[PDB]
C-alpha cells in the first residue's frame with residue numbers, strides 16, 4: 236500500500252533508532268538518511284492509519300503559494316497551525332498587557348489552571364489579527380517562512396525573487412532541466428531566524444510526461460509532522476503538474492534526521508497495529524491552471540476513509 | 547563490498563534509465579532520487595574497479611577548504627580539473643590574441659589539427675596564471691565555486707559568511723544539532739552563474755561518537771563525476787571527523803538526477819565486468835587538527851589497488 240513507507244520508517248526508528256538527549260529535557264530516537272517513495276498514480280498519500288486534516292494542509296499550502304506570511308489568511312480558513320510562533324512574538328513585546336506566561340509551551344499541557352488563561356489570550360490575539368489591519372501588519376506577519384523563501388527570496392541588491400514561479404516556467408519550457416530547484420535554506424538568515432526551515436529544498440524531474448518531486452527534509456517529527464509534510468508536497472506535486480499539463484510521477488521524501496520523541500512512543504506503536512485502506516484520490520479544478528490563484532474549493536479529496544485521529 | 551552501490555547505480559541506469567535528449571545533440575539515460583550508502587569504518591570508498599586519481603581530489607578539496615577560487619593553487623598542485631571554465635572566460639575576452647576557437651569543447655576531441663593549437667593555448671594560460679599575479683587575479687579566479695559558497699557566502703549586507711567553519715564549531719559544541727548544514731545553492735546567483743552547483747547541499751549527523759554526512763547532489767555524471775564526488779565527500783567527512791575528534795560514520799549520497807551519456811555506454815559496461823578488491827584505508831596527520839590548514843602531505847591513502855583507468 237501507498238503509505239507503507241511511512242509505517243516502515245516509524246517501525247525502523249522504533250526498532251533501530253539512536254537515542255539522543257533533547258533540549259526540552261526529553262530525548263529522541265532517530266535515524267539519518269532515510270528515504271520514502273510514493274507513486275502518485277496509485278492514489279493520494281494522505282495517511283489512512285490516522286486521520287490527517289486535509290483542509291489545514293490545503294490552506295497552509297495555498298498560503299505559501301501566495302507568497303503570504305501573514306497568519307490572517309490562515310485564521311480566515313480556520314487554520315491555527317502557525318498561530319503559536321506569532322503569538323510568541325506579540326507576547327514577548329511592549330504592547331502586551333496580560334498574564335506572565337514565559338514559555339507558555341512547556342506550561343501549556345500541565346496545569347488546567349493556566350491552560351484556560353492562555354487559550355483565551357490566544358483567542359483574543361486571533362481576533363485582533365483578524366480585524367485590526369495595523370495589529371495584523373505588526374504581529375500577524377511571521378517574516379521568513381515558506382511563503383517568502385519560495386516566492387520572494389530577498390537578494391543582496393534589496394530586490395526579491397520568485398523561485399517557485401521561475402521554476403514552474405522552466406518546467407513548461409525546459410522540462411528536462413536538472414536545475415528545477417527551490418531552496419528554503421538561506422545561509423544569511425539561518426543563524427538568527429526563529430525557524431531554520433525543516434523543508435530544506437526540493438527538486439522536480441520530468442520523464443514520459445510525468446512530474447516527480449524530491450524533497451530534502453533536514454529534520455522530521457515522524458509522528459506529528461511527517462504525515463502532514465507528505466500530503467503538502469504530494470499536493471504541491473499534483474498542483475504543479477496540473478499547471479504544466481503533465482501527469483504525476485513520484486514523490487520522493489528524503490530525510491536528514493527523522494525522529495520520534497521518547498514520550499510519543501506508544502501512540503505510534505498503537506498506529507502500527509492498524510491496517511492501511513485504499514488511498515484517497517485527488518480532483519483539481521479542470522478549468523483552472525494558475526496555482527498561485529487556486530483556492531480551497533479548487534482542490535477536492537475523494538474517498539478518504541481513515542482510522543481515528545490520535546490525541 | 548564498499549563500492550557495490552556505485553556499480554548497482556550504474557547498472558540500474560543502464561537497465562532502467564529513462565532516455566532524454568540532451569543539449570549537446572546527444573542524450574542521457576537517468577533516474578531520479580537514487581541513494582548510495584558507504585560505511586566509512588569498512589574502508590575508504592575510492593573505486594577499485596577503475597583508477598581514480600586521489601591526488602586531484604585531495605588538492606581540489608583543500609582548495610575548497612581554503613575558501614580559494616583561484617585555479618593558481620590547483621596549477622601548483624598539478625591539478626587541471628578546473629582549468630577549462632577559467633580558460634573559457636579569458637578566451638572570451640578582449641586581451642586574447644590567438645586562434646578563434648568558439649566552443650573549443652565540441653571541436654576539442656574531433657580533428658587532431660585544432661587539438662594541438664588549443665593544448666598549447668591552455669599551456670600558455672596555465673603558465674601566465676602561475677607567474678603573473680595581475681593575470682591570475684583577473685582570469686585565475688572562478689568566482690562563485692565551492693570555495694566561496696562554503697566559506698565566504700556573500701550576504702545582502704555586503705558581508706561574507708563562513709558556513710563550513712561555523713558548522714564545524716557547532717559539531718564540536720552541539721553534536722546533536724539537526725541544523726548542521728552547508729548549502730552551495732544561492733537562489734540570487736543561480737539564474738546567471740556559469741555553473742549552478744551540482745553538489746547542492748550537505749548535512750552532518752552524529753551518533754555514538756561517529757560523524758555521518760549526507761550530500762544532496764542535484765545532478766550527476768555517473769561515469770565521469772560520481773567516482774570523484776564520492777571520494778571528495780568521504781574525505782571531507784573524515785577530515786571534519788578528525789578536527790572534531792570523532793570516529794567516522796556513514797557517507798550517504800543522494801541524487802536528484804543521475805545520468806549516463808548515451809555515447810559512454812560501453813565504458814561503464816566494461817567496468818561492470820570487473821570485481822571489487824578490498825578498499826584502501828586513509829591516514830591523517832594525527833598531530834594536526836585545523837583542516838582549513840591541512841596540506842597534501844597530511845593526507846595519506848594506504849593500499850589502493852585499482853584496475854586500470856578508463857579512457
Ligand SMILES: Cc1cccc2c1C(=O)N(c1ccc(C(=O)O)c(O)c1)C2=O
Pocket residue numbers: 295316317429430431456459460461463
Ligand atoms: C505538523 C505541522 C503542521 C503545520 C505547521 C507546522 C507543523 C510543524 O511541525 N511546524 C513546526 C515548525 C518549526 C518548528 C521548529 O521548532 O523548528 C517545529 O517544532 C514545528 C509548523 O510550523
Ligand SMILES: Cc1cccc2c1C(=O)N(c1ccc(C(=O)O)c(O)c1)C2=O
Pocket residue numbers: 606627628740741742767770771772774
Ligand atoms: C569530475 C570532476 C572533477 C573535478 C572538477 C569537476 C568535475 C566536473 O564534472 N566538473 C563540472 C562542473 C560543472 C559542470 C557543468 O557544466 O555544470 C560540468 O559538466 C562538470 C568540475 O568542475
Ligand SMILES: O=c1ccn([C@H]2C[C@H](O)[C@@H](COP(=O)(O)O)O2)c(=O)[nH]1
Pocket residue numbers: 431433434454455456457459460461464724725
Ligand atoms: O514540517 C515540519 C516542520 C518541522 N518538523 C519538526 C522537526 C523538528 O522536531 C522540529 C524543529 O527542531 P530543529 O530540528 O529545527 O532543531 O520541527 C517536522 O516534522 N515537519
Ligand SMILES: O=c1ccn([C@H]2C[C@H](O)[C@@H](COP(=O)(O)O)O2)c(=O)[nH]1
Pocket residue numbers: 413414742744745765766767768770771772775
Ligand atoms: O561533481 C560533479 C559536478 C558536476 N557533475 C555533472 C552533472 C551534469 O552532467 C553536469 C552539469 O550540467 P547541469 O546538470 O548542471 O545542467 O555536471 C557531476 O557528475 N559531478
